[model samples]
Target: PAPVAYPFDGDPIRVQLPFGEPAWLVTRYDDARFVLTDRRFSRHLATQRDEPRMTPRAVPESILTMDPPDHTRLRTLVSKAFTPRRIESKRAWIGELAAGLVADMKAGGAPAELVGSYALAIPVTVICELLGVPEDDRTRLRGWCDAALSTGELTDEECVQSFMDLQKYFEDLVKERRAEPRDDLTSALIEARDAHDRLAEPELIGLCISILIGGFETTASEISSFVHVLQQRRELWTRLCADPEAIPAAVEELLRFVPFAANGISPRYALEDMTVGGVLVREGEPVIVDTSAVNRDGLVFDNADEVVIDRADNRHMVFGHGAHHCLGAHLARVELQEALKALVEGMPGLRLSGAPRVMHVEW
Candidate 1:
């Protein structure tokens, strides 16, 4: 089989998988954005009701899965907490954490598990601190996120169990928070929405679960991939270290190369007959946007495969376009910049442990 390359001219050439279900793979950039933002399609998959549930574990359904009204209301209520001002407030805190982690790395010598020690730990810790998750419970928190966010095949029971475990964890937290509100983001969210009566018990549980699964890995995977790539690309790493101003630009390039979610766009079932990339999509058809391909489309970007850190006029869809674009993008940017800068600045001679390892491409 050929490598799963991105940014193709149109949709993928369909091939049947072992499970007997049909899937349409989208590869082009514009077509992807259209599929993601198109109103005729719906994300609140009613099919989940009939089909064998995706996971056996019982977890709260977050706004990420819902389409309108709910998405609009819940997201609006939480918007103030995720604004640029709020995200920027963590800069000093994130930088300090990164510095301490890098110093620990140096003390341990080379070839450390950067993902567990730094990339994964940083955002999870920051977010936990923001939410006031106690210090002793972080290990368990990592387990929950890793289990829930996995891309591998699993029996539905295991999946449901994973989600149920998280729900129980958050149920306890919410009960405690209601009794004694703290100085964390969770308390702020509850208080922020009390006036509007927007967030309910399910919404609170779902939001925390969402934060656990969605919040951590997106930046962690990207950063881990960036560290691996920068170690290989000595010239680029050297330039970034010499020029601290280039950190932000490098972060953009990193997003293009190492976006964490590999399953294309989420499944949005068609509500009406429509065409995407000239293919006739029926009312019940489910659409998948192959984002990896779109980020590398030739028509959208010249010399698309190569990483151009300062690629001007670069309007990549690493953050989805239009209304459903990632809400935490600004927070992601702050975290990525400080993390990358801390890395390069700390280790002027940082390079790969060995010849680069081309890990398996995820679906």
Candidate 2:
């Protein structure tokens, strides 16, 4: 569903979603931003029992689900440390990791699966280093986190169990950091929390798990998806290999063009009766913000559905909008830029070998 038209005019159409009560699907850019930032809507309530959701189980409480004072407090603890400067500081190491992965992929020969060998490795390892996760426990954390973020791949019991497992893992890790600090994000967050009024125990654990999952999963998928798109248009790939400087600009377009979790997973509920999209939405109502639709807002982006690698003036909501905008956006951009540069400088011979085994590759 390329965002072809602005279907909303201060009035969102209510639809019967897959689960719970029927909720409004905010498709246009105007409405999407409003729902994302509006105080009338509350993410905290969406985590409550019987909240309208796309899946059987509502999303667990994390920073993603909190509203201000609560949201403000939690976000404040990490925003100080998860800064653009800190991410830029690690750029060289990330570049090294990207180049090394590309070299290994080349050594392994062509027709290698990009997801396991390159895509997953780059962000996973980067996040591990950032969070001070031990190399030995890297794979285990990845598995646990994957299950915890499962949409429908895992059973309900499996999802809950994985979250519990992840919480326990981070609980111990946080304990270790409290006793002995390290030069990592986890330690920084510990310091931030302890320095501040005080972050509750579960809040601390939830924050770690949220950051870990957010750090790699979307980013890793984006790396492979970028490859999937570029390789399909061989000329685009060739041009990038020839002019690697264009990678950063290209990444902006790719982020806009690519759709990851744009099916609108995070639903927010109406805290009180309010007008949504020129229509009345009673209290206790929920709305799913179709961000992909927002990203493709033709009013905002010319040829929004098409990929223009060198396109300028992109204002995509792929990282979302408002207070809930992605915390890892800077790190993600750097990672993508470095990853593309590595592939261009090291893996120019690579091509799309077979059908990409991904769910949402809509053009």
Candidate 3:
């Protein structure tokens, strides 16, 4: 098959989002890395506008919008809970959760939509449990999150209301956690804001919403994609089933292999004139790293189009890079590893029941 058709005809070409705003699409691995790590490209500036964005519309006032000192302070406050050790501690629980879902799928019989029954359930449950949200509220929370993320479906007024609805939910949750803290991330954030006054009120709400959206969407979608790949290639599924220990390496390859084209790069604005891969981006111009193409760049990987489950030295940019690297990277890895491990070990002969296209899971 031909290489995935990118938006631009060439790497680092100028293009416009559906909003008609201009942006630079950087596709090469080196350029993508540079755009993400370079100090000249600013995520904070991208969130300054009140209008529509090429990236996420909400979480504008959160850590997603903050640069150093501010980013450092906010990241530090919540970093402890998401540490490798902390996230590793939850592995047993995640394992049990994945096992339960797999068992439920088996009981529910064949032709199960893994997207909902298995993939989506794991992250939603884990994130909710981590944040101390009651189990009963998860379905409703998912609905609100889906509505907020639905770009063309919801009217402007409805979209705003959906976002506001999420904000209101988090606001009340924060207040509840404030009055009586609990043994969860939300309470920890509350303590950080209230006890030390480390962050502002709006920052607290923004961070909560950011974490919710961040933790929920990407992982859920990726798991479904992972399952799709394994099922489509029966040989890969059989190998995994035969040697369950190889599941970890396989999960990394899946993360690298999965085409997350829909999850476009977060918009970053240039702080000043800068040359990214020989293209001079003016100050305040929006530049987005096309991680989808970058992951498959031949310059970065030998046979980048193929899925090498045991490929060593794989440094894909799935979780992103730099100071703003995914806060839940460790947690996400744990979830992927455990979820795939459970599926491969438990569900033998697990193949897609229908036409196999990349599942566009609603976050």
Candidate 4:
């Protein structure tokens, strides 16, 4: 099957995704932001029966599929943990993890599988530590996460089983945290649910699962993707290593360049009739925001598809925008920046064994 090309020259085209169902695919940058931020388009309806979806499966209720007061309340409960100060505090620890992974990869010599050994290792370790996951349970937890996230790799039965395993794991973990309260984020959330009466047990469990899945996947994939692109252009890698200050901006550019087009998984349904991008989106209509296409919109970016390391005035929506913007954005950036710096500084002759190919890399 041919790849689904992003619609760049259309006014919110109504198209059928490769999966099956039809949706209003918002392509332009401004339109994508509007659909995301506007309360009229509701993610809460995603789990409702008869709601439009590309798949038949009922999405598990989580903060990602929430709206207004519920979303605000749930987000506020854990907002402090991902704040700049809180995430920045882990800078040294994350840097150490990144360097250690690079050392292991270097030890294995050339032709190392960078994705599994180097890229995936850092975030999993960091997230596990932050969530206070016991070292003994990390491997099992990591396996469950990989199975759950890899839709193409896992069979339908396997995916369902992975979720069941995750639910049981989190249920037990949350219960344990409740019994013996600690200073970790999980313990804090349990306190909020039990002592403060802020959220329900299911919501609490859902939040932990969501954070665990979200925290490690994108950061890990981007680590591999960024390295893959840099290794393709040796001069770019050389320049980044030469100038330390340029890394921050380079990270942003790399994010913009590398397309993580998995934004449409959680479709936003219309709560009320509204006109978006000069098209009428009726109530119950599904709106799928194409973050990849939005990032490549020429109106907002010059040479949108090209990688410009020091690209200025870049306002890419890689982490998304509006009320449901990524809660772990700060922590993710810190992880990526640290990983990139470590790879550049620690591994001097970092080069891929062959030309970067579209290997079956999962987020």
lDDT of each: 0.69, 0.76, 0.74, 0.75
Looking at candidate 1, the ten consecutive residues that score lowest on lDDT are: 354-363
Off by over 4 Å in 4: 1-8, 18-20, 49-56, 148-154, 193-195, 355-363
Best by TM-score: 4
Candidate with more favorable, higher lDDT: 1 or 3: 3
Q: Score candidate 4 by lDDT.
A: 0.75
Give a tens-digit lDDT track for model 3, residues 1-363.
122233533358675654525677777888888788878777777556432243345435668777786777888877754557767889999999999998887887776767667766788788888888887766557655555334546666666676677788778888888899998888877666424646556777788778778877688877878877776776888898898888889888888888865434577888899888888888888777777788888887888888898997899888888878889888988999999888877777566645122242111
Which residue pairs show collisions in model 2?
10-277, 10-278, 11-277
Q: Candidate 2 residues 165-235, lDDT tens each?
A: 78788899889988899988888887785254666667777888887788767887788889888877878
Question: Could you tell which candidate, 2 or 4, scores higher by lDDT?
Answer: 2
Clash count in backbone of candidate 2? 3
How well does each candidate superpose onto the true structure, as a TM-score? 0.86, 0.89, 0.89, 0.89
Off by over 4 Å in 3: 1-10, 49-59, 148-158, 193-197, 355-363
Model 3 residue-pair collision total: 0
Per-residue alpha-carbon lDDT of model 1 for 1-363, expressed as tens digits? Answer: 232332223654342222223446677887887778877877776335221123333323567667786677888777755567767888999999999988988888766666677777788887788777899866556546666445566556765676687788888888788789987777767776636566787788778777766668777777778877776676888889899899998888877765433453455667888878877777776666656778888888888888888999878788776556887788788888999988877877765443112222110
Model 3 score (lDDT)? 0.74
Count of residue pairs whose backbone atoms collide, per candidate: 8, 3, 0, 0
lDDT (Cα, tens digit) per residue for candidate 4, span 132-244:
78899876575565773355577777767777777888788888988998777788776663235466678777888888888877787788789888877879989998986
Query: CA RMSD for every model?
Result: 4.8, 4.3, 4.2, 3.8
Model 3 per-residue lDDT at 118: 70
